[PDB]
Amino acid sequence: QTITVWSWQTGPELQDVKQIAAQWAKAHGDKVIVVDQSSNPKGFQFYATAARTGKGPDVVFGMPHDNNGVFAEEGLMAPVPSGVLNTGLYAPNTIDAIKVNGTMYSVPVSVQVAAIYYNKKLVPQPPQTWAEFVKDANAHGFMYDQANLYFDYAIIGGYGGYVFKDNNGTLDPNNIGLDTPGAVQAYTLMRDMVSKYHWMTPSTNGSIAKAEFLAGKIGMYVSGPWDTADIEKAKIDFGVTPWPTLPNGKHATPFLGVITAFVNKESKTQAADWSLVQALTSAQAQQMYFRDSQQIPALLSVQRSSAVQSSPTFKAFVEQLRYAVPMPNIPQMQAVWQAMSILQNIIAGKVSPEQGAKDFVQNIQKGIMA
Ligand SMILES: OC[C@H]1O[C@H](O[C@H]2[C@H](O)[C@@H](O)[C@@H](O[C@H]3[C@H](O)[C@@H](O)[C@@H](O)O[C@@H]3CO)O[C@@H]2CO)[C@H](O)[C@@H](O)[C@@H]1O
């Protein structure tokens, strides 16, 4: 009798999802319960853990697109019905992000590109070049989730590295670019931010950086709209700006992430499920999510709205979009996330950038047991 939605988005966006769900239930009669999985210890892949034993939700809301390759390969996702998605209403990369083996398996709700969040009280105007960045980082501090590939990939790609080679829109899982000479240069810079610039210590991570930023102790840190609520609560007069150009004069290449919503193949109420997904991902819903969290809408028409076009978050997004690399969504991407722990070793100076890079790729190539 009840439709269960698992949401990986929390805070104000979760409140909006609950509101929309309640309105939907009011018209349809079907009861709806929205569960917050954002802090679940098993992470995003918890959907697979649950669905593999037939204990998953009816609908999933707020799932980063890279995770869906696993879910789709295992047959845990209902293909999107014909006509539900109008590809012309999104940027090309946005729709490609929700396709697995050429089939659309989820609906785009938001698009994300990590950026530098800065404290205007400490840094009035944001740095754009590495030189300017060093000056501001030295003067007021800089920290981020340095050992997390999702964020530090911006540096890797900036030096020519890549995860899986993209050719003709298709990714080659065997052609990895995380150990190229360019990637090694990037890892060297990551280590340098600790050993040379002293902006961070080997223990610095995302949690610590966020805490320091909310306390007004550092002027810059790398984040996204998921922190909007907490930043405003801390009363930080924050700004958003693109990653600065790197020491090699090139632009950093942060990942492009697409937040998606989808239906469990095992759900007994597929038609109702897609109707609920439509309500949770409509232009109106996206307008709400933006107003309350600054999450950039996946729909181009909402991106072109006055509220979005005038925002600092969108300005940074549009400035980085051309350099953003969509996260791979093939199953092998999980092997990459699972082997990135070696980045910490490089940043701590326990292993050289060259050796660490080599082992990183070798570990990825071991793959994941089916
Ligand atoms: O680190 C490995 C991890 O990288 C990618 O995850 C990023 C998310 O795509 C991105 O949205 C953001 O996650 C935030 C949630 O969306 C938000 O609701 C709330 O829970 O805070 C999160 C920040 O901790 O950042 C993560 C990276 O930390 C990739 O999509 C994952 O599959 C992968 O495991």
Side-chain angles (χ1 to χ4, degrees):
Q1 302 176 301
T2 297
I3 294 179
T4 297
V5 176
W6 279 10
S7 176
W8 262 268
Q9 294 308 302
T10 186
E13 195 176 320
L14 176 62
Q15 281 290 65
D16 294 327
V17 166
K18 287 177 176 177
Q19 294 175 50
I20 293 169
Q23 289 177 294
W24 183 88
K26 189 177 182 182
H28 294 266
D30 300 54
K31 294 170 291 183
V32 180
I33 177 64
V34 183
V35 182
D36 186 348
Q37 297 285 13
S38 66
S39 289
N40 190 301
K42 292 188 175 182
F44 299 116
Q45 288 294 306
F46 179 59
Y47 173 72
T49 296
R52 283 162 181 161
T53 67
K55 299 183 178 302
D58 289 292
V59 172
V60 172
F61 178 87
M63 178 66 259
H65 76 93
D66 62 296
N67 291 282
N68 299 344
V70 175
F71 309 157
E73 83 171 306
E74 289 184 38
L76 312 175
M77 302 173 86
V80 180
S82 297
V84 173
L85 282 178
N86 186 321
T87 62
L89 302 183
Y90 311 84
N93 281 182
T94 303
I95 283 294
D96 187 282
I98 59 78
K99 290 180 180 181
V100 181
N101 287 303
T103 293
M104 300 184 294
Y105 280 102
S106 64
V107 175
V109 311
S110 183
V111 287
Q112 301 178 152
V113 177
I116 292 293
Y117 281 60
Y118 62 105
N119 185 158
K120 297 184 176 182
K121 179 65 178 181
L122 306 178
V123 184
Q125 292 300 304
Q128 293 174 290
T129 64
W130 186 255
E132 305 184 313
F133 184 78
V134 174
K135 297 178 182 181
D136 293 323
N138 280 354
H140 299 290
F142 170 66
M143 301 178 101
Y144 85 114
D145 206 2
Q146 70 182 327
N148 187 338
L149 180 68
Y150 177 76
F151 294 105
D152 68 33
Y153 177 78
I155 300 173
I156 298 175
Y159 278 80
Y162 55 88
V163 183
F164 301 118
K165 182 65 177 301
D166 173 55
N167 68 297
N168 186 60
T170 302
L171 297 180
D172 180 351
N174 188 67
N175 193 340
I176 295 165
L178 296 172
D179 72 307
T180 58
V184 172
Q185 281 181 285
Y187 299 140
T188 298
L189 176 59
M190 290 180 213
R191 168 56 178 166
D192 280 354
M193 289 194 277
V194 170
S195 64
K196 165 180 176 178
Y197 296 103
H198 301 321
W199 299 326
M200 297 175 277
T201 67
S203 61
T204 300
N205 56 30
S207 300
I208 294 177
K210 183 177 180 177
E212 296 299 357
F213 186 81
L214 295 178
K217 295 182 180 180
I218 56 173
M220 305 180 293
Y221 88 125
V222 186
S223 193
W226 48 84
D227 277 354
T228 298
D230 296 313
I231 295 174
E232 302 183 309
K233 183 179 181 180
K235 301 178 299 179
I236 300 301
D237 177 30
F238 80 92
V240 186
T241 192
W243 267 82
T245 48
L246 305 168
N248 64 175
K250 301 302 172 59
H251 280 283
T253 63
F255 281 123
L256 163 65
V258 179
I259 297 302
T260 74
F262 64 83
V263 176
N264 189 336
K265 179 75 179 66
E266 177 273 318
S267 180
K268 295 185 176 182
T269 52
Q270 306 271 167
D273 295 340
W274 284 111
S275 178
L276 180 57
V277 165
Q278 287 190 174
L280 295 174
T281 64
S282 70
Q284 179 173 59
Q286 289 180 38
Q287 295 173 185
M288 291 182 73
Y289 304 147
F290 177 72
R291 179 187 294 289
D292 306 323
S293 69
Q294 297 298 286
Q295 288 277 331
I296 302 304
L299 287 164
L300 296 178
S301 68
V302 188
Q303 286 185 6
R304 292 164 68 80
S305 70
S306 58
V308 177
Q309 289 288 309
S310 65
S311 71
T313 299
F314 187 66
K315 181 177 176 181
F317 173 83
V318 300
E319 286 183 43
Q320 302 199 99
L321 195 55
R322 226 301 71 186
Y323 307 107
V325 180
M327 286 188 284
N329 74 349
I330 57 182
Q332 294 91 330
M333 190 57 198
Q334 300 310 125
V336 176
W337 299 135
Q338 284 171 44
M340 73 181 180
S341 62
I342 188 175
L343 296 174
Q344 188 74 298
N345 296 297
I346 297 176
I347 298 178
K350 299 182 176 183
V351 303
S352 68
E354 294 76 6
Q355 193 51 58
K358 180 182 300 185
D359 294 310
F360 183 20
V361 175
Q362 293 193 183
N363 292 341
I364 290 171
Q365 297 172 302
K366 296 183 181 180
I368 292 180
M369 183 179 87

